[PDB]
Amino acid sequence: ELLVFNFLLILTILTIWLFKNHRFRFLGAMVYGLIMGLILRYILEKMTFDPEIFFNVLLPPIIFHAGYSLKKRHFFQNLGSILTYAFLGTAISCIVIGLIMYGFVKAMVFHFTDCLFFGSLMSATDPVTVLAIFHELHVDPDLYTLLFGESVLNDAVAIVLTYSISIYSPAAFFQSVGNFLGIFAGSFAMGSAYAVVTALLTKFTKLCEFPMLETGLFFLLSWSAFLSAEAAGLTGIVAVLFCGVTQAHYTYNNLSLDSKMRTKQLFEFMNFLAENVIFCYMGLALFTFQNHIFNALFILGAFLAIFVARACNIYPLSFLLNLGPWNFQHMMMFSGLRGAIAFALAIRDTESQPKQMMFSTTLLLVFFTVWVFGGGTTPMLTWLQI
Amino acid sequence: ELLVFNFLLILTILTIWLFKNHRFRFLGAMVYGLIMGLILRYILEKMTFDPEIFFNVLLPPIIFHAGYSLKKRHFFQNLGSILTYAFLGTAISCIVIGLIMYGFVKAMVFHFTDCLFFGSLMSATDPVTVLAIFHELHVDPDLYTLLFGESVLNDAVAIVLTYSISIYSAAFFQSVGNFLGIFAGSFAMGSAYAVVTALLTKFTKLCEFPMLETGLFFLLSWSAFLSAEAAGLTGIVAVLFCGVTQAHYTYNNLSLDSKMRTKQLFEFMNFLAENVIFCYMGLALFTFQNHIFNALFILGAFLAIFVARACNIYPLSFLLNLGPWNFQHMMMFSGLRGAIAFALAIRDTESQPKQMMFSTTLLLVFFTVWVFGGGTTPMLTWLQI
């Protein structure tokens, strides 16, 4: 680990500059996959030692910022739509499996549980680049709130849902579903339990006179909720921390007026370290030789599956919502990226199943392919209508 | 390990809690480690797995903030004294070894090179307790701006000096060159990133992206530490300490927004120094193979503490006065011992069980100087403001 980190820093500086360099260019760190990966084909494995456990512990700060940055324009305005699209992840999973199951069976003219696992893994959808474009343009506030709320909810559903599948064992159907309800409900109550303590502590006691103390305890109490998830054995540790959204609505507004900017900037800095997650796609795209060894030509079934499965269950859900506005257009625009979280699930022990290794191969190619939607977002906006 | 890191926060929360109430009490977090240890003394080793190499990677942010928090009121009047205090750490190691040589030779009624490690280790001194009291009371600014100097200067000297003895065994001739070469090399490449950081944003307009430059500042500052260890140049904490030029040049150039953000970002990590302050007690109750020795050399080390702080500053005091100083601050220099000295005490901890007694003594030294550090207010009021 001496110079292993140093590889990240040099390209990160390039990533920092390209944001200021390519400010008006036609067009992130996604480009450097060909640059940094290829030059080191000829010490080699030490670049991507990267224990899969470590990735999970550095992701919670990324998603905690998402839950702590709500502009409070959806708690009562479009909350129902987000909760309606919370069930979309179940719809996404049940449709992706319906196609990829026929994909490998007809490819050979291996089991079925990985197909269920793959569908849950693919259910994540976090278009980070798309959300960044919307906010800076200072337009379509309703459209911005739609994608942001959906992207921060399905991933929380995806992580808990894929855990239930991984522990499913064939009656035996109910307890696997019961785990999904029990863990998610436990994550909401226990996760917010530490958040409630922070809110009342800073609202009754006049602790706002000590900016250093309030900021320190806020980070520790938020971190303790994430840490308490593993200690109690309740999974969905990201969801546990993500359920600290009440901190931004109640704890944030108590009495500080000074650490308000200090707290958001602190977690924004950790949120700004997402390029380490981004580079991990391409840095390990060639270093993980044992992972991408297969590169089987089954991606064509996956390619067609991801495009239609997301599209074929967003209009019907909106149609159900139309029963009780929506511009009849945003549903088509919803087709964004395929989530940063999905990569983390693809590296879960990396050896649980032969075709499971192929999942990581498919995910990497999709990421280098789905990003054209982010690049091709502006023509999509101007194609028919805004 | 998942639950081990959890209970390290509740006692850190209590650290925040104690300072909320202790704004008027007679007087902090140093004792919470013992309280948790006693409860856990009655699964056990997993609390203090704590690889010793990982201790030296969470420590540099403490050093960087110390070098980044200079008040710029010491280099103009007390710089010569502070630079002369770099020899204090060297002469301390020269006298401590002789005092500790008689500690065991006369007691018997290891090897000499092992005693050198302990002597150089004592040169480190980080009186965080005294400095905290000074700033909050707004007292003796002249003494504060120079006491901070030696406090961090010898820490950079201590780490390189205790590493230089690795070649000691006619091998003593190149030791001085190796010590000076590494220290000089640390200043060159360590401050080079600060120069690179300064010129990068002095010409370009990074003010439109205050968030981008903050990451770049952290990325560039971290690179200096990482590049030193990767290239084999030791004194990595000293290399990051050479980031004081970041405050001299980069801090004041054009930011006007991230200046407070950068200070608060690093001081928050420096505000998490209690983790260093908490690591001792867990190892002081569970690692019976390491700390249980506690041989009857504590008093010998205890006597060596005061004389080392007295037999060295006093001879140098006359030289500095030759070119006022009121002749009073010299007696006050009998201060704390710090926390970086522990990081040297945990250098692989596996020389010999009979030789590892020095680590046991150092833990007691912090406890004995904690109450001594606590009883600082009577000393301050007695002499002068």
Residue numbers in the entry:
A (entry chain B): 23 to 49, 54 to 68, 123 to 189, 199 to 259, 269 to 422, 428 to 489
B (entry chain A): 23 to 49, 54 to 68, 123 to 189, 199 to 258, 269 to 422, 428 to 489
What does the paper say about this structure?
Na+/H+ exchangers (NHEs) are ancient membrane‐bound nanomachines that work to regulate intracellular pH, sodium levels and cell volume. Here, we report the cryogenic electron microscopy structure of NHE isoform 9 (SLC9A9) from Equus caballus at 3.2 Å resolution, an endosomal isoform highly expressed in the brain and associated with autism spectrum (ASD) and attention deficit hyperactivity (ADHD) disorders. Despite low sequence identity, the NHE9 architecture and ion‐binding site are remarkably similar to distantly related bacterial Na+/H+ antiporters with 13 transmembrane segments. The NHE9 monomer consists of 13 TMs with an extracellular N‐terminus and intracellular C‐terminus.
NHE9* sample preparation was optimized for grid preparation, cryo‐EM data acquisition and structural determination at an active pH of 7.5. We combined 3D classes from two independent data collections of ~ 1.4 million particles, from which an EM map was reconstructed to 3.5 Å according to the gold‐standard Fourier shell correlation (FSC) 0.143 criterion, which used ~ 5% of the total collected particles. The EM maps were well resolved for the TMs, but a few of the connecting loop residues and a larger, extracellular loop of 52 residues, located between TM2 and TM3, could not be built. Surprisingly, there was no obvious density for any of the 90‐residue long C‐terminal tail regulatory domain (CTD), likely a result of its predicted dynamics and intrinsic disorder. The NHE9* construct contains 97 residues of the C‐terminal regulatory domain (blue‐dotted circle), but no corresponding additional density was apparent as compared to the NHE9 ΔCTD density maps. Despite extensive efforts, we were unable to obtain any structural information for the regulatory domain of NHE9. It, therefore, seems unlikely that the C‐terminal tail in NHE9 interacts tightly with the transporter module in the absence of binding partners. As model building revealed only minor differences between NHE9* and NHE9 ΔCTD structures, the later was used for all subsequent analysis due to its moderately better resolution. Superimposition of NHE9* (wheat) and NHE9 ΔCTD (core transport domains (blue), dimerization domains (orange), linker helices (grey)) structures, which show only small differences in the most mobile regions.
